[PDB]
Amino acid sequence: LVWVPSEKHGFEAASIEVTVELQENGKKVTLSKDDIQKMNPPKFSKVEDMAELTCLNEASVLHNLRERYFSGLIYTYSGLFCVVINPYKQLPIYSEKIIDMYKGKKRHEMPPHIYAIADTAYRSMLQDREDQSILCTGESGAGKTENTKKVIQYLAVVASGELEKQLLQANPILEAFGNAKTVKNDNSSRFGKFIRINFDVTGYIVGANIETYLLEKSRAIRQAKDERTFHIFYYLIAGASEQMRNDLLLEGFNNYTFLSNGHVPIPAQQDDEMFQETLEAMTIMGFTEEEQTSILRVVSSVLQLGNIVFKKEQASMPDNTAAQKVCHLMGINVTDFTRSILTPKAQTKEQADFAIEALAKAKFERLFRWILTRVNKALDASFLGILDIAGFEIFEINSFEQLCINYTNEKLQQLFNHTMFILEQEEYQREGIEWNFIDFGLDLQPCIELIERPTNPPGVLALLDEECATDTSFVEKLIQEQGNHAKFQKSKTEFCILHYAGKVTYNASAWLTKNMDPLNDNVTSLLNQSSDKFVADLWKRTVGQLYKEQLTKLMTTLRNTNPNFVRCIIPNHEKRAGKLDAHLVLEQLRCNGVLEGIRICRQGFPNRIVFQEFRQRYEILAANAIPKGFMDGKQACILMIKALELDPNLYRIGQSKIFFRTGVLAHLEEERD
Numbered sequence: 001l002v003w004v005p006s007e008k009h010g011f012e013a014a015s016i017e018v019t020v021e022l023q024e025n026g027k028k029v030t031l032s033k034d035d036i037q038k039m040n041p042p043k044f045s046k047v048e049d050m051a052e053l054t055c056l057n058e059a060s061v062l063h064n065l066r067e068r069y070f071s072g073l074i075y076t077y078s079g080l081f082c083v084v085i086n087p088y089k090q091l092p093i094y095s096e097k098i099i100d101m102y103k104g105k106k107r108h109e110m111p112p113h114i115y116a117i118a119d120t121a122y123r124s125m126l127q128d129r130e131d132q133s134i135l136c137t138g139e140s141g142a143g144k145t146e147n148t149k150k151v152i153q154y155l156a157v158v159a160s161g162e163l164e165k166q167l168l169q170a171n172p173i174l175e176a177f178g179n180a181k182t183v184k185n186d187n188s189s190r191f192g193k194f195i196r197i198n199f200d201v202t203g204y205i206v207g208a209n210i211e212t213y214l215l216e217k218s219r220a221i222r223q224a225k226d227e228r229t230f231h232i233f234y235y236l237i238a239g240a241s242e243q244m245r246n247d248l249l250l251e252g253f254n255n256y257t258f259l260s261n262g263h264v265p266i267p268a269q270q271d272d273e274m275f276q277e278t279l280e281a282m283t284i285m286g287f288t289e290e291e292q293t294s295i296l297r298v299v300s301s302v303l304q305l306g307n308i309v310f311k312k313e314q315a316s317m318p319d320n321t322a323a324q325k326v327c328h329l330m331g332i333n334v335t336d337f338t339r340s341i342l343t344p345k346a347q348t349k350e351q352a353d354f355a356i357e358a359l360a361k362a363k364f365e366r367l368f369r370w371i372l373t374r375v376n377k378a379l380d381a382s383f384l385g386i387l388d389i390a391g392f393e394i395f396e397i398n399s400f401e402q403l404c405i406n407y408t409n410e411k412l413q414q415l416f417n418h419t420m421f422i423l424e425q426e427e428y429q430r431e432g433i434e435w436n437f438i439d440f441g442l443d444l445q446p447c448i449e450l451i452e453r454p455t456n457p458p459g460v461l462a463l464l465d466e467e468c469a470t471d472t473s474f475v476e477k478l479i480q481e482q483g484n485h486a487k488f489q490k491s492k493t494e495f496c497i498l499h500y501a502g503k504v505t506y507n508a509s510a511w512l513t514k515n516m517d518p519l520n521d522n523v524t525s526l527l528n529q530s531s532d533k534f535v536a537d538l539w540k541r542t543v544g545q546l547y548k549e550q551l552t553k554l555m556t557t558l559r560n561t562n563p564n565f566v567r568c569i570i571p572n573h574e575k576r577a578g579k580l581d582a583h584l585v586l587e588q589l590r591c592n593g594v595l596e597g598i599r600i601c602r603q604g605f606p607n608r609i610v611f612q613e614f615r616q617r618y619e620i621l622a623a624n625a626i627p628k629g630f631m632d633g634k635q636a637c638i639l640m641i642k643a644l645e646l647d648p649n650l651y652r653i654g655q656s657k658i659f660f661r662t663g664v665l666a667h668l669e670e671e672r673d
């Protein structure tokens with residue numbers, strides 16, 4: 001019996017170039033030897049930790065995952081890291097009762113769960129007095145958020161009671177203004193986010209600070225088919241009280257042009273419901289009724305901006321109604337506004353339209369930054385970062401937003417590679433372990449440099465910053481500079497980047513403008529001194545550049561924390577539950593380095609404890625192991641190990657600690673009880 005490749009399923013069971021006979025079709029086939037992969041004994045049905053597997057190959061991992069999946073188990077430890085496959089359905093596994101069952105539990109004492117990741121990260125923090133970070137990876141839709149949300153849910157329920165109560169409102173609020181339905185995801189985060197929870201030396205939660213990245217402002221004014229803008233718009237429009245309806249001078253879903261595809265209903269969501277849900281959370285978060293109405297008022301103005309209309313001839317808006325409403329909602333002067341918009345320098349429809357849009361997006365980006373800020377005020381020894389970035393996406397038309405998002409995903413995958421494979425081995429040699437380096441063949445440096453290479457060989461981002469000159473002109477130079485670059489491909493101002501997750505063909509249209517983010521300082525000032533305080537508050541070098549900075553500051557913070565990767569796999573592309581796309585899964589398992597991540601956890605020594613700790617934790621397993629009196633950590637360990645009759649292959653004695661093979665300490669622990 002063996003694993004042979006297959007179309008329907010990544011691999012198929014077949015009994016033995018080689019000529020086997022498929023167990024399903026029965027059809028006898030003749031395939032190369034290198035195409036066959038060994039099956040594992042039935043004893044390995046749904047192993048919780050695939051490092052355990054006797055045979056570790058794509059075929060066995062995929063199988064182990066497929067099985068647990070349809071068995072309702074979506075979490076599977078794979079070496080150090082963990083894998084999660086979107087159930088796309090509700091599962092009875094996130095109760096509070098279960099949070100209890102997982103309290104202070106060791107990874108090996110409980111089936112794989114995001115709670116375990118949360119908890120073990122928690123303890124490890126106190127245990128080694130080192131800042132921790134749980135990093136969720138995954139293509140758009142995989143599950144990064146549902147899981148980030150579970151980690152916070154768990155932590156709030158164990159170390160906290162207001163803070164906790166509000167902590168659990170952070171996302172419900174943020175999601176409402178920064179999430180939106182994309183073809184890939186209905187509740188898609190259109191902005192990355194690093195939630196950092198602060199604890200005291202005791203271990204109790206003390207603060208919490210949320211940092212967000214790359215908010216897709218553009219979505220505020222346009223969305224592709226079957227796509228809708230930020231939830232909050234649909235929420236307010238659909239659930240505002242009649243008095244607010246006309247207080248905000250709100251319209252209908254088809255009275256607003258920024259609402260591209262009018263009202264696009266969500267699966268299992270009710271806008272009117274979510275609106276009260278949002279107001280409830282804002283309430284809990286501590287927002288005053290006026291803070292909330294002021295926020296909702298800004299949302300409305302952003303929609304009304306879209307209704308303004310300019311005509312050709314310069315450009316002139318015959319109908320100022322919208323311009324009137326907008327100003328009414330902004331505490332601005334209709335004529336001062338109309339003037340600053342139509343002539344700050346003559347403006348044509350084309351440029352009048354732009355300015356208005358630019359303002360819309362700018363107005364929203366700030367309302368978000370504000371809400372976030374306010375949330376941070378209300379939420380504010382050791383910290384536990386949690387990173388829910390915007391997942392890799394390849395939409396029909398990929399703009400500058402997607403480049404940044406996917407670039408960040410490439411940056412995160414690399415962080416995984418580095419940690420998992422480089423840092424791992426570095427520590428080996430550094431601690432003096434008999435170890436010969438293993439090039440696991442996983443490096444994204446190239447592509448990453450092809451984008452963020454500031455100096456020396458100009459990269460996409462910097463070439464642009466330079467560019468700002470047609471957008472197309474940008475593409476032309478980008479080619480002449482990169483063109484050949486391995487992870488580059490000439491294509492309408494389009495080009496292709498071969499991201500680890502796949503080949504994305506970008507469209508540089510408007511990129512120059514997008515990277516500059518030009519506002520109409522005229523109207524901009526008007527708002528700066530709006531009769532309305534909130535507005536005024538809201539309005540009290542290049543984008544690419546700004547991001548690079550923020551990203552690096554993050555990577556660094558992350559660099560100074562013990563990372564815990566949770567690899568989220570998307571099962572299918574039909575937002576369907578119970579449909580595991582064997583190949584979509586295999587591909588994901590591939591670019592995530594999951595197999596290489598399990599090999600190193602096997603070929604190396606994942607666990608590693610300091611002499612003393614090993615001595616105290618397991619001296620009981622060999623009481624008559626160490627001399628009665630003073631016994632140096634090292635010699636003491638060496639004694640105990642001998643006393644335990646540990647196979648020398650199972651460990652290594654480094655300078656300051658013993659390195660153990662996967663699951664060795666585990667067994668030691670089990671024996672210990």
Ligand SMILES: Nc1ncnc2c1ncn2[C@@H]1O[C@H](COP(=O)(O)OP(=O)(O)O)[C@@H](O)[C@H]1O
Pocket residue numbers: 086087088089090091138139140141142143144145146147185186187188189388391568
């Ligand atoms: N463990 C889970 N339980 C329930 N639903 C989940 C789970 N994981 C993901 N989902 C489903 O997948 C969808 C999107 O996952 P999400 O967390 O939004 O991904 P991402 O942050 O990577 O964009 C949700 O709208 C939900 O229906």
Ligand code: ALF
Pocket residue numbers: 138139140141142144145184185187188189190388389390391392
């Ligand atoms: F909402 Al995403 F990756 F698309 F977290």
Ligand SMILES: [Mg+2]
Pocket residue numbers: 144145146187188189388389
């Ligand atoms: Mg998300």
